[PDB]
Design an enzyme around this catalytic site. Structure first.
Site, PDB file in Angstrom:
ATOM      1  N   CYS A   1    -181.543  68.979  -7.478  1.00 13.57           N
ATOM      2  CA  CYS A   1    -179.939  68.531  -7.925  1.00 13.57           C
ATOM      3  C   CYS A   1    -179.621  69.301  -9.142  1.00 13.57           C
ATOM      4  O   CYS A   1    -178.611  68.900  -9.691  1.00 13.57           O
ATOM      5  CB  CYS A   1    -180.260  67.118  -8.197  1.00 13.57           C
ATOM      6  SG  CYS A   1    -180.562  66.030  -6.640  1.00 13.57           S
TER       7      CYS A   1
ATOM      8  N   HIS B   1    -174.838  64.034 -15.668  1.00 13.75           N
ATOM      9  CA  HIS B   1    -175.282  64.053 -14.321  1.00 13.75           C
ATOM     10  C   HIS B   1    -174.924  62.879 -13.511  1.00 13.75           C
ATOM     11  O   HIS B   1    -174.872  62.661 -12.361  1.00 13.75           O
ATOM     12  CB  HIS B   1    -176.922  64.280 -14.345  1.00 13.75           C
ATOM     13  CG  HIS B   1    -177.581  64.828 -13.203  1.00 13.75           C
ATOM     14  ND1 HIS B   1    -176.800  66.062 -12.297  1.00 13.75           N
ATOM     15  CD2 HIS B   1    -178.524  64.350 -12.202  1.00 13.75           C
ATOM     16  CE1 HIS B   1    -177.700  65.846 -11.101  1.00 13.75           C
ATOM     17  NE2 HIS B   1    -178.540  65.171 -11.059  1.00 13.75           N
TER      18      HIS B   1
ATOM     19  N   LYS C   1    -169.424  61.689 -10.536  1.00 16.32           N
ATOM     20  CA  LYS C   1    -169.833  61.430  -9.423  1.00 16.32           C
ATOM     21  C   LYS C   1    -169.452  60.126  -8.786  1.00 16.32           C
ATOM     22  O   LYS C   1    -169.624  60.012  -7.733  1.00 16.32           O
ATOM     23  CB  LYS C   1    -171.416  61.512  -9.799  1.00 16.32           C
ATOM     24  CG  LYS C   1    -172.010  62.826  -9.442  1.00 16.32           C
ATOM     25  CD  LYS C   1    -173.615  62.657  -9.414  1.00 16.32           C
ATOM     26  CE  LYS C   1    -174.215  63.756  -9.338  1.00 16.32           C
ATOM     27  NZ  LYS C   1    -174.278  64.740 -10.836  1.00 16.32           N
TER      28      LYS C   1
ATOM     29  N   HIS D   1    -172.736  62.608  -5.071  1.00 17.00           N
ATOM     30  CA  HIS D   1    -173.747  63.700  -5.668  1.00 17.00           C
ATOM     31  C   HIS D   1    -174.117  64.764  -4.468  1.00 17.00           C
ATOM     32  O   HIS D   1    -174.627  64.498  -3.256  1.00 17.00           O
ATOM     33  CB  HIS D   1    -175.093  63.055  -5.738  1.00 17.00           C
ATOM     34  CG  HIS D   1    -176.248  63.570  -6.515  1.00 17.00           C
ATOM     35  ND1 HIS D   1    -176.022  64.991  -6.632  1.00 17.00           N
ATOM     36  CD2 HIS D   1    -177.376  63.480  -7.236  1.00 17.00           C
ATOM     37  CE1 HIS D   1    -176.993  65.595  -7.327  1.00 17.00           C
ATOM     38  NE2 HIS D   1    -177.749  64.466  -7.464  1.00 17.00           N
TER      39      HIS D   1
HETATM   40  C1  LIG Z   1    -187.348  64.126 -12.235  1.00 19.18           C
HETATM   41  C2  LIG Z   1    -186.469  63.485 -11.568  1.00 19.18           C
HETATM   42  C3  LIG Z   1    -184.951  63.319 -11.781  1.00 19.18           C
HETATM   43  C4  LIG Z   1    -184.446  64.073 -12.845  1.00 19.18           C
HETATM   44  C5  LIG Z   1    -184.209  62.360 -11.253  1.00 19.18           C
HETATM   45  C6  LIG Z   1    -182.612  62.307 -11.204  1.00 19.18           C
HETATM   46  C7  LIG Z   1    -182.073  61.509 -12.326  1.00 19.18           C
HETATM   47  S1  LIG Z   1    -181.719  63.839 -10.961  1.00 19.18           S
HETATM   48  C8  LIG Z   1    -180.891  63.278  -9.363  1.00 19.18           C
HETATM   49  O1  LIG Z   1    -180.121  63.761  -8.895  1.00 19.18           O
HETATM   50  C9  LIG Z   1    -181.372  62.004  -9.116  1.00 19.18           C
HETATM   51  C10 LIG Z   1    -180.639  61.262  -7.923  1.00 19.18           C
HETATM   52  C11 LIG Z   1    -182.125  61.330 -10.059  1.00 19.18           C
HETATM   53  O2  LIG Z   1    -182.631  60.278  -9.617  1.00 19.18           O
END
Ligand SMILES: C=C/C(C)=C/[C@@]1(C)SC(=O)C(C)=C1O
Ligand SMILES: C=C/C(C)=C/[C@@]1(C)SC(=O)C(C)=C1O
EC number: 2.3.1.41
Lengths: 403, 403
Positions: free
Chosen positions: A162, A297, A327, A332
């Site tokens: 991601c 994010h 988002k 996403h």
């Molecule tokens: C190591 C794990 C991480 C950074 C997880 C995140 C926060 S990053 C993402 O795009 C989604 C759906 C998550 O749950």
């Protein structure tokens, strides 16, 4: 040394071009819809962040026959970026100093699964055909764009789940800094399919309680968020060496004044927070101006959302920037999220406004003393920051500033 | 500024560690076997470049639940490289100056297909499970190693098909040069399965005329080569900043004195030659010692083989180095090919010998400009070059020199 963005292109759930995207952002318009394909596959999550465009005869047949959706989305975005940068073939093609760094989070589970299904059928090999490799290969987004656009410089993809397209842009910046390239097209793409989406649903990562009201499913920071809403699309920006840009009278959105890339080295599928802290701090290192807006994010997941809030707060302390998770509007797009959100941030910097963090009916108590902007507000921004994280504890942060 | 290799690890068709690989190389031992899996799958190619190691229980159960074969192979290779380099946990763990850049060519077609298959069963999501994303995602090799190994620096994968692990090492070198990291574990992994292999066979890329004699199937430069022999495995090297290596007294194999990364911008699935020529020349900037040995990409495919030999001819003219295609022995591990062959080159530099280019019963008419050693040759080597190319016209070249 210095890298600037002189063009952008985007195909997303809230717009098929930068103008349409601008509209949705300022309007606070949702790109989420109900998906029959997902409901049909057996999934619990039936909401989509789909691209509303008929891509049929948009790419040449000989070229498009090697591509999968992620490649198509990135290819169309690249065209938009080439156009929007003011670049012509004679200026970017067959030129050793022009490169391409773009990728996706999952490549093409659809065509990987198509080749397997086709192979086990009574026709086997003939049912598979000679184009599955380029469509399913992890480097599809880069391979499929570099060849038709006749790129002669760097040609590869960066994959960090991601966070991939964010790392792609940061890598392009390093190429300019190392003096290896004058121009690097950076970004990525991601297909939307039950084949890949079902995997995330299988781990309970997707929203499942708001299928009746698709536009309310993605609700970053809302006390009742229940997972992210998957999406597909593409984005591409033209990372260019400052002098080169100025020399050709290029239009400059901003300059990449910060790029952070760190690792958690803790858990998979769950963020540690400290990793993001170091990442953001690394991106702000040397930036003599304050961060006016932060495009988080913010995936709309219980842990992730507040974990990033905790990180932001430790990095900024009392003086936190305005925050908004686009988002909640767009969904996403996984590997395409990084470049697409860098583009939304660039659009906000370019049009003096902060896109809203929608669907927050009840602010999380974990998101206390911060500045989550829930109203489209006009403001003269100068320095903006965008965060991107992915499974495996991989973090990326980009800081963009006006010239 | 300067990057050196202070440790290596490898799990391959010709060895499960650097000692076994060394022996097989000196002996020109084939790692190719007949595959019932591929034959039962309906493929025309039934020969394998398999890892002869049951990996069950070789990795913590809680840690390997997130991994696919490519990740397992790379993880085991990194365990080796860490110990080889003489790095203690306290030396490389929880350290922002230590990173990981590793990837694969196809990720995990097997788990992309398993997720889809499980989904369409009477159990749907419950049959899919919560670990398919990390196994199927393109960034698997990097995500699955960075987390358990406690990496705090860079964390992402580079994907450039059959050139990925080569670009991974080159990128690690740039991190050291940019002063961002002191140590970067670079390399990659690749699973072996009909799911991915049938796609290559479907485009006629794999050997199909020597299934009765597996060890003779991979025959780079032989007038009767008929495609490459697919393989799986992993490799990992410790790219370290010079002053850092010397400060701790690390044992240095060679210094990376050259890294070329170019693009063809011509055809997919077919090399242009031009591009590989710029890639090699690019790797040679600054290097003023001769190239003593060249580990070619030599896949054993009709076009590829002589297109790369034409390029080598162009780069060196009348002064061509000793050449050998170790793929005739090991097979083509796709994304892992780059790091694995860098390791073979490093081993030849270390023990003073040139591994043979086996199975050349005839030698294409185009290979008249010899020096393709077909016999193990003891020789003191100083500077060696390794080429890696992949679909989409992506090229990489690494030049390593003794200190
Ligand atoms: C190591 C794990 C991480 C950074 C997880 C995140 C926060 S990053 C993402 O795009 C989604 C759906 C998550 O749950
Ligand atoms: C653009 C296409 C290229 C570089 C093709 C090559 C030579 S690379 C490779 O691993 C195989 C099997 C090939 O045929």
């Amino acid at each position: 040394k210095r890298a600037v963005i002189t063009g952008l292109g985007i195909v997303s759930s809230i717009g098929n071009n930068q103008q349409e995207v601008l509209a949705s952002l300022r309007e606070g318009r949702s790109g989420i819809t109900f998906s029959q394909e997902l409901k049909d596959s057996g999934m619990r999550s039936h909401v989509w962040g789909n691209v509303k465009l008929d891509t049929t005869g948009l790419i040449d047949r000989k070229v498009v026959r090697f591509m999968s959706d992620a490649s198509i989305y990135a290819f169309l975005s690249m065209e938009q970026a080439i156009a929007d940068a003011g670049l012509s073939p004679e200026a970017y093609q067959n030129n050793p100093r022009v490169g391409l760094i773009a990728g996706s989070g999952g490549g093409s589970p659809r065509f990987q699964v198509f080749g397997a299904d086709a192979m086990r059928g009574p026709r086997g090999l003939k049912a598979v055909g000679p184009y599955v490799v380029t469509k399913a290969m992890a480097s599809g987004v880069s391979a499929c764009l570099a060849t038709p656009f006749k790129i002669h410089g760097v040609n590869y993809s960066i994959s960090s789940a991601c966070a991939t397209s964010a790392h792609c842009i940061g890598n392009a910046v390093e190429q300019i800094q190392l003096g290896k390239q004058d121009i690097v097209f950076a970004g990525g793409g991601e297909e939307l399919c039950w084949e890949m989406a079902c995997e995330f649903d299988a781990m309970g990562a997707l929203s499942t309680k708001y299928n009746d009201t698709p536009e309310k499913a993605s609700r970053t920071y809302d006390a009742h968020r229940d997972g992210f809403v998957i999406a597909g699309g593409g984005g591409m920006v033209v990372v260019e060496e400052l002098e080169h840009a100025l020399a050709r009278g290029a239009h400059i959105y901003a300059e990449i004044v910060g790029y952070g890339a760190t690792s958690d080295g803790a858990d998979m599928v769950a963020p540690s927070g400290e990793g993001a802290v170091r990442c953001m701090k690394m991106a702000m290192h040397g930036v003599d101006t304050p961060i006016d807006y932060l495009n988080s994010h913010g995936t709309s997941t219980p842990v992730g959302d507040v974990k990033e809030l905790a990180a932001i707060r430790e990095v900024f302390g009392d003086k936190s920037p305005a925050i908004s998770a686009t988002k909640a509007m767009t969904g996403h797009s996984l590997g395409a999220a990084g470049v697409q959100e860098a583009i939304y941030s660039l659009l906000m910097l370019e049009h003096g406004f902060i896109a809203p963090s929608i669907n927050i009916e009840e602010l999380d108590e974990q998101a206390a003393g911060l500045n989550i902007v829930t109203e489209t507000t006009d403001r003269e921004l100068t320095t903006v920051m965008s965060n991107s994280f992915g499974f495996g504890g991989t973090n990326a942060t980009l800081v963009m500033r006006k010239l």
